[PDB]
């Protein structure tokens, strides 16, 4: 499973690329049932919404649900990831982000790499983020907004909650890096660069939007933290190369 | 300037219709210069943001800036409006709403019930005409309609649960188009405004045209004339481009 030449060049130039229809509706169903089951596990890997009534983020479902292990090693994701990075890979981070219905606007613009570098000791942006749409993503249910091409800016040379950017910063960025929101049916995949600027739009719809993000990292690019590292469910520690898996996802207890 | 057969049907079934490029870039420019001039006029018709820094809304700019008079009577707006209502028309309300950059809102509402029960508007024999003074994109806070929700009419004198039920039958749709575009929408349609997550303000002009025979009959103290029109004299339609005019 490979990106076309144009898809590679789109990833390189714009910082993201959308692969619609990567996983079938049957596969989406299997993953959604596994997500519902995993949301019942109580732990600090599960971030509840402010009102505590729903799950906002879930870390490391692939360690608890076999379907998500299957996904994480699927040819359809690791093929494109290996194509881009040309090395053995392991899972730096696995998370499922839920944007609740009627969720309101939050200032969430950020860049992944600078946090991983300065908080977690990630040396270099030799990684790729891979999103899997567990919901249809539309203009109304809180799509990810990229600043197109903004990964070309690199990252400044130089606790996690201290990082942020100002409206004035965002304004300057949009000048050369316009807002773009990939929209597609559940089962679609998008790959995006660790140094791209992104945020999610508010979900004004009555339905939650579930977005799975796997970050694959070069086994030679393992974090070298200076202090106590964050939990393994946030930042992977096992750099054993992933074994790729061929075939459909299937229900697995 | 007539709506096509499909555009009439669209308006009836879905409650809104978009006419892209109705006014040209040069006409948008003249309108935008008039907007900036009117935004400096102090008065109760000018609604500023809570920080007093910028203007959030302007009422009745057509009474102060000649190009907005020209706009308000353009045959490109009155042709469609007269075609839909088949009567003489006057201006019920003229408003410019500016959605500041980086500004949720939860603005789901229907105009007619407000005008009926606040102002004594008898019937929904009016049409709302939006004119895009800025581009309208998915990011700068477009109006979001619940398609077809005007078919519900209006109860005799909303919540998330109600909105969730509504969207099943009346899906969200947001007209998006370049500045100068026009959209007409039904007084009974449910609409809101998505948040503006962009760095630029979005300026949307709404003219409500009303049947001269449907003038408000308020039982209470009428709202001021710059909010709710009182002069029911039929509008004279104006042909031709907009032009700068002191």
Numbering used by the authors:
A (entry chain B): 1 to 158, 171 to 265
B (entry chain A): 1 to 103, 105 to 158, 177 to 265
From the paper:
Like LdoA and EcdK, GriE belongs to the 2OG-Fe(ii) oxygenase superfamily, whose members couple the decarboxylation of α-ketoglutarate to substrate oxygenation/hydroxylation via an oxo-ferryl intermediate. Recombinant GriH purified from S. lividans TK24 lacked the characteristic fluorescence of the expected F420 co-factor but nevertheless led to 4-MePro in a coupled assay with GriF, indicating that GriH can use NADH directly without requiring F420. Together, these experiments suggest that 4-MePro biosynthesis starts with the GriE-mediated hydroxylation of l-leucine, followed by oxidation with GriF. The crystal structures of the leucine hydroxylase GriE have been determined in complex with substrates and products, providing insight into the stereospecificity of the reaction.
The canonical iron-binding motif is formed by His110, Asp112 and His210 and has lost the metal in the apo structure. While the residues 159–176 were not visible in the electron density of the apo structure, this region is well defined in the ligand complexes. A third loop comprising residues 232–247 is tilted away from the active site in the ligand complexes.
